[PDB]
Symmetry: D2
Subunit: 329 residues, 4 copies
């Protein structure tokens, strides 16, 4: 004598409710909502759980998203302040962090994040024993290490956003300059995400044709080098203009989630453990071209760098290991 009872019947047999391609997003900031609507519009997960400390914002973010249910293909969207809401995720994207202050040292900024992360990550793993973690949070190479360390996960289930977006930018900028789509242009920015990102000049090509062999070359002087500077700059440009970044980043991450979720074995410049790779001896994460599948990092693509390059590589590893003087102040 309920509408529901009058209109929906039952087979004699049934099985407890279920989610198998669950994904969780931590942080409902600009990066987090951006990451979350790109996964949803991509139909990568049969469940998306949203987790932040900001009650109100979380709930409202959650609702905005549910109201659009009709337009999507993800059955269940949820949000929680509590981590148990994330219980049973395939993949976790972390986008929560502090942003670096007036007179803040990279050491002190990294410490602040360690103390937030101590509360996030341990709870993630306990609710999600079989998850893979994807760290977007900047500084990414150090926050990746931290996440690694705080969780207790096999190193292959710990991935850093790293240098994917930067490469996506480089490829864009080649493309504009060359007149071909960004996806026909191929170049790789690897190493330590940011100012200290190495641009593999010698891997740049179109159709299989090496720019380097054609332009007479190029690395040292006659405007092309520029292409790397506003890859890193044009990024501050954005902020100076809009007051934050979200869109390209979110998309970048759905790109990663599709590979992983669809078990593709697609090659991405992501932040990995590069220990005893290119003469690096300690526990440092930086970008290298990795194959990804559903269990995280399946393999590494061994570039053949110049010394010039691997030298630079090593200077990041040192500089990062140095910071790794963490656990308090």
């Amino acid at each position: 004598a309920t509408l529901k009872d009058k209109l929906i019947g039952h087979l004699a047999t049934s099985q407890e409710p279920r989610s198998y391609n669950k994904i969780t997003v931590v942080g409902v900031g600009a990066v987090g909502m951006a990451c979350a609507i790109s996964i949803l519009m991509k139909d990568l997960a049969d469940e998306v759980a949203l987790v932040d400390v900001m009650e109100d914002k979380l709930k409202g973010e959650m609702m905005d998203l549910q109201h659009g249910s009709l337009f999507l293909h993800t059955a269940k969207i949820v949000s929680g302040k509590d981590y148990s809401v994330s219980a049973g995720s395939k993949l976790v994207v972390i986008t929560a962090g502090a942003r670096q202050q007036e007179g803040e040292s990279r050491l002190n900024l990294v410490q602040r994040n360690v103390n937030i992360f101590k509360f996030i990550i341990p709870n993630i793993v306990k609710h999600s024993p079989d998850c893979i973690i994807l760290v977007v949070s900047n500084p990414v190479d150090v926050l990746t290490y931290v996440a690694w360390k705080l969780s207790g996960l096999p190193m292959h289930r710990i991935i850093g956003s790293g240098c994917n977006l930067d490469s996506a930018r480089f490829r864009y900028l080649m493309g504009e300059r060359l007149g071909v789509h960004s996806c026909s242009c191929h170049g790789w920015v690897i190493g330590e995400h940011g100012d200290s990102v190495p641009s593999v000049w010698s891997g740049m090509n179109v159709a299989s044709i090496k720019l380097h062999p054609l332009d007479g070359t190029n690395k040292d002087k006659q405007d092309w080098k520029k292409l790397h500077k506003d890859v890193v700059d044009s990024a501050y440009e954005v902020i100076k203009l809009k007051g934050y970044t979200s869109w390209a980043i979110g998309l970048s991450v759905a790109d990663l989630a599709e590979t992983i979720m669809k078990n593709l074995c697609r090659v991405h410049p992501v932040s990995t453990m590069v220990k005893d790779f290119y003469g690096i001896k300690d526990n440092v994460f930086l970008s290298l071209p990795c194959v990804l599948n559903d269990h995280g990092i399946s393999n590494i693509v061994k570039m053949k760098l110049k010394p010039n390059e691997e030298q630079q590589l090593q200077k990041s590893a040192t500089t990062l290991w140095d910071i790794q003087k963490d656990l308090k102040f």
Copy 2:
């Protein structure tokens, strides 16, 4: 002796550059960026031009989006303060408006928008003679009329967001209550978008089964009516929580753009000219189920409303026509 010249050759024959499924978005606010990334993730247009008065924000919004080029299928993204940037669009989405103030009258709020719109819309049509306009801006029924009036477009090329999102919400809320996806549940909120939205109780169904016939009925008393109140409420809920709305709205609009762009002849509850429909005698826009194709509104779905219902319909038309005392103060 240019890399570009060394690497890209030419056929003897070629034809001036081209965009045919161009879409333009006005306003790079929360609604506008939301509308813009849903169209892009949907691959509805071979060009997206972004237009706002806020230089900085526009440029940076534009860039964020371009950097993600690799991840999309839209060849050209652009932004301009100038309207000529929008030159040649199939569809224009307007999301620019004033938000209603302390002690603001719906009359005075509508006037403020008339004076902004005087600068937007006339320029749109001159640059885009064959466009269709889609108004998202609230109050939508009145802003639709204004856009109609300011442009000089056939009435069928002027559409209002109207009551689509509200219906999408109603359908969601049925769904949660019934245990079926929002897309198997069917109900329609029509009329004047907002508090004065009519819920067609008698069209509600699942598989073809009318709830009304089953629940003994329902319209007047025993909790179901609720379903309409937090459809309109849960909307303020969102704002009170997040401080704005974007996500469900953007998705809502891509839903509309796909129909139009793909010439589908899909039925949507959108804001149209309802003049001499349901005994309405003047130049008022409200929601009715419309068929859409690439030329805007192809037809109207003639509901069979009760008087109770059409009465309510008429009270909006009156109330709106009343406001239509526009052009200044």
Copy 3:
């Protein structure tokens, strides 16, 4: 000293290879290859295994498909004569059957299929303990029962193609006649798939508007009834013309696989156990609007049929139960 060894390195940690959204197709005929390329183009499974007895055809079908790898998003395609190739599937689509001969009785045609199925289905379940089965094979209602019976699966994990495609056809034909897309038109053909399919005249509508109330009505005389006859006819038309059916069927099935795989709770007219539903007392499968999720049939949509209708319903159940005099000749 292998290219592979020179170019691909390893993290110290890794985990055995994996497929989680595996789907298997039995039969590489017109229906089977059609079903198989629609799932692939839909990105519903991270593995598709193809199974037939015809070695050659299987292998070549398999290869055609792999060669297109670059164009898809399914990581692993395989084929086997052996059933162990299907080991670990979420969903199994069966499209293998005999086609009915000169002077063949529905009884004798159903028997022939029982003897083929004895070899297929038992092996499916042993390799795939947690699969759901989807029977496309005609006669579908009886072959569904057989599959049910031969496997030992909970009744909810046994689905019949049933009346989905027929409904899809009815909706098409309404649409052409009405001028609206087939997805805005809503009508339901249920019951026993084929000549004996009941068209729920009274659920037909557009936007929520019941044709029945508008056309003065219609069920008995003034050309509309036709709409049901060439729904069933236009189907023989096809064969008489092309020599088989594949395209609409395959698409129909991907529609079903998406619901199930994405856990949607979407309502489909599929062949289910209708025992003690509409006064049916025995173990007969026919179509009813079902909600589907990842565990097969989650619920039934209780239509409110007329006697005229449920009578017809009962005449199928009888006629089918009669055939169910199976196990040999």
Copy 4:
């Protein structure tokens, strides 16, 4: 007093029906139906017209496809024996040809096709003044030239399937051998489609890493060369097995149609006019990496081939120009 009249009303203003992203397929064989369902499942056109001489087969092919309307996003599917049905297409895919007989000379096989094509292509262009033509028909390089010649189209609006699928195969086979997805592996088969296809050993790479530099090299002896032989062989393998090819080819072509239709400027190894490119002096079509947009071939990617390679290139051009002794017998 028509249901249609009782239920669908009108705005006072409207505009004649319309298709803007129209695509036409010639030939409803295995290649043609394969090409046609991949475009449809891809949502590349708001209209698909199907053209063959075989009445029955055409009609039935057409119907199969329409019945699935509900499952797609293309508004209008049509078929005609007459070419006016194709009136107004953006793109035309030709898949009609003769298949080469017992004791048939490539000269005589090419002549047979010239006489079929005389009836197809001239009519295409008259109904579709602004179309681009895409030839799938084998021998592709010669049939492309013929289509070029019979139509009177700018050379950039005449494209040959060429060497795309072959490259897609090579990439697959690298991938299986390397353990990375076919889309992270990059190699190019260019030149004259088939046995005489040149494999650019020196452009092969993963992430930007040249296999050639790593394997010590490879071109001449130690099993890798194989990779090219069963690229061309494994193709006969398929036929010997299945009795034809369709699937990988169709997908291949949707890949091309997406680029063109979405104006991407994506680089494809397609059959173009290579006249005075690599010391070729006459009117011969072969594969080169081309940028494509909506007007056909926008540019050519100038590889830097070895003589060994360009020599081979020239031997095709000669051999093809030789055949070009066409117009009768």
